[PDB]
Design a binder for this molecule. Structure first.
Ligand SMILES: NC(=O)c1ccc[n+]([C@@H]2O[C@H](COP(=O)([O-])OP(=O)(O)OC[C@H]3O[C@@H](n4cnc5c(N)ncnc54)[C@H](O)[C@@H]3O)[C@@H](O)[C@H]2O)c1
Ligand SMILES: NC(=O)c1ccc[n+]([C@@H]2O[C@H](COP(=O)([O-])OP(=O)(O)OC[C@H]3O[C@@H](n4cnc5c(N)ncnc54)[C@H](O)[C@@H]3O)[C@@H](O)[C@H]2O)c1
Ligand SMILES: [K+]
Ligand SMILES: [K+]
Lengths: 340, 338
């Protein structure tokens, strides 16, 4: 009764995660060696991507140059991929998860579990757990696919309520260069991923206004406190300050505020006066996560009269959407709740 | 009734703190505007003279005016003896002799706060020699920026509520924001331990590792700071205290821009010894490596050397010739992931 794994997704992250999962699923006796990977079919040079993956063991489109363990089987039909699976690993861009869940509903093993790697503010893991009826875990941290594929050292956090399922997901994904901490707070692990991008816009505003590292450190820390307080006020699950010390909190926050794309655009916006829109295009055209999340935060907070409790988050919103001069951003932190 | 302040020290940080304290003592009713500041005498004319006449510590806070209600005083007993609040702000190497001179000479019920950053806690050395209750002030700050009124925060650790609130009023400005917490030891130990983590962060930069690897090193450093404090420190120790400025913020500022970091990187990137890079770039002694060696002695006595692989990797690369290129291997079986 070794557990069967299906990787629902085969993009950049899915393919890199497949390198690890395939290896661990072969080596460890608690897992079935046959790992299916749902691959949305595509024509590459008049050839089928699933076919290329099953003959060359390389995702020539989304992770070229890397070999996948040969026990990882591309399957183009998502129902066929997942139907005998004990563990599903959801790793697709957020815009497709709905349709995927609408094709899988009613078709999963009765005992199937899920972990979401997908990073009105409802948690994507809840969208999946509700539509499919499976317990959901999450996998979040300061990490990127290219580096994980290159075995460059980094960590991630796993949020999973059940201890035995947590231990199993760790076994499945942990390597010497991809280190895992399991915690029981799914909602907390998961919400960090959206909030951190609001803070990084503020961090970039700090850079673009010409301030130094000690000011930027203050902006990030206050951002973190606002992330914790907001998660305690919004999330159903239990929420502890100590969970934000995991990779999903402080590490992802700092890697984003110091080297993120949201930060680069934010900086350029403050130094130049060019709009957020123009800078996204000039620096491919993919929109910024932070600003839209801040708008969504404003709606939630404004509807409960707490806009005042979150000056960083709200200052990000007002500069991005209500014409507040970016040069006021620091002023907005001079009477912060943390210092009352 | 009105509380008097004495700033013990007149250097870069003491002079910047004088600007804030002088400003605030003059303005707020509950402090005596007369703020004494102990100034070790120098021939700049007489340094104390220069300050008191020209109100600028030309040598230490250059390009700034100090408030006129701050009085340079060349003898430390005279500066302090009427003070209710003593602000200790001198380099570590001097605080011993200064306490030796102050012992027994202080006002009844005097209190102190240490700004001295850098195992026995300096606030305890001061409080034990002088027999006064001690607080600490520590965070992601530097005097130049604080003199220029550039926005930053700090943490005060103070066991007594009314005393913490008094220190917050004395030192807080719109661009110098304070959070008061009750855990003195926890606030203070961060300042020593952070520089070890910074050395490791610097190794990352010099070996060419990416931001996500470096973030992992910093984070693991922070977990090691917390665990070491819970193991080492008197008084209560809270994980959440390390979310304050003295913890995570001072740690990231030091790891993305400190002298410990720059030297560590150059050592990893060029191969040039730490002694050599100390002489060239500073021959002032990097603080991170020595703290690491002290940690190693302590952890041996407790049988815990295996539980702090980041701290002990810094130590072994710096002192036992472990190759810096293998630093990351020591983090691949970390207690955090067990
Ligand atoms: N790339 C990274 O380094 C990284 C790191 C951490 C988290 N993530 C997260 O993983 C998730 C996926 O990221 P990615 O980089 O792998 O995306 P991607 O663009 O590389 O993924 C392409 C995949 O998306 C699916 N897909 C594409 N078009 C589809 C369509 N018309 N209909 C149905 N499905 C379609 C398919 O499964 C396809 O294989 C995101 O939520 C992301 O934030 C990525
Ligand atoms: N400079 C900063 O930005 C900053 C920021 C935070 C914390 N600190 C810490 O504050 C403490 C003081 O730092 P600083 O930058 O003001 O140092 P500094 O070197 O500028 O201090 C000069 C002072 O040191 C004393 N001193 C010098 N020679 C002496 C002697 N022979 N005998 C007795 N006393 C002598 C005198 O009080 C002199 O005014 C340190 O622990 C430092 O880590 C500094
Ligand atoms: K197996
Ligand atoms: K006064």
């Amino acid at each position: 009764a070794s557990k069967k794994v299906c990787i629902v997704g085969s993009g950049n992250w899915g393919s890199a995660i497949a390198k690890i999962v395939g290896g661990n699923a072969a080596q460890l006796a608690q897992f079935d060696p046959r790992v299916t990977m749902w691959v949305f079919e595509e024509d590459i040079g008049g050839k089928k991507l699933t076919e290329i993956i099953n003959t060359q063991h390389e995702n020539v489109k989304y992770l070229p140059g890397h070999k996948l363990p040969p026990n990882v089987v591309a399957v183009p039909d998502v129902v066929q991929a997942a139907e005998d699976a004990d563990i599903l690993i959801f790793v697709v861009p957020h815009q497709f998860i709905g349709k995927i869940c609408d094709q899988l509903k009613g078709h999963l093993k009765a005992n199937a579990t899920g972990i979401s790697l997908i990073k009105g503010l409802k948690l994507i893991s809840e969208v999946i757990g509700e539509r499919l009826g499976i317990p959901m875990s999450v996998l979040m941290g300061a990490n990127i696919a290219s580096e994980v594929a290159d075995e460059k050292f980094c960590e991630t956090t796993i949020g999973c309520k059940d201890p035995a399922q947590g231990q199993l997901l760790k076994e499945l994904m942990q390597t010497p260069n991809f280190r895992i901490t399991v915690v029981q707070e799914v909602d907390t692990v998961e919400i960090c991923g959206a909030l951190k991008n609001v803070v990084a816009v503020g961090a970039g505003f700090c850079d673009g206004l010409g301030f130094g590292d000690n000011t930027k450190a203050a902006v990030i820390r206050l951002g973190l406190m606002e992330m914790i307080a907001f998660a305690k006020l919004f999330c159903s699950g239990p929420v502890s300050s100590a969970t934000f010390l995991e990779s999903c909190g402080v590490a992802d926050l700092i890697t984003t505020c110091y080297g993120g794309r949201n930060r680069k655009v934010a900086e350029a916006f403050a130094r130049t006066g060019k709009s957020i829109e123009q800078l996204e295009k000039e620096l491919n055209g993919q929109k910024l996560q932070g600003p839209e999340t801040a708008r969504e935060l404003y709606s939630i907070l404004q509807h409960k009269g707490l806009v005042d409790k979150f000056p960083l988050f709200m200052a990000v919103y007002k500069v991005c959407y209500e014409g507040q001069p970016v040069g006021e951003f620091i002023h907005c932190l001079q009477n912060h709740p943390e210092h009352m």
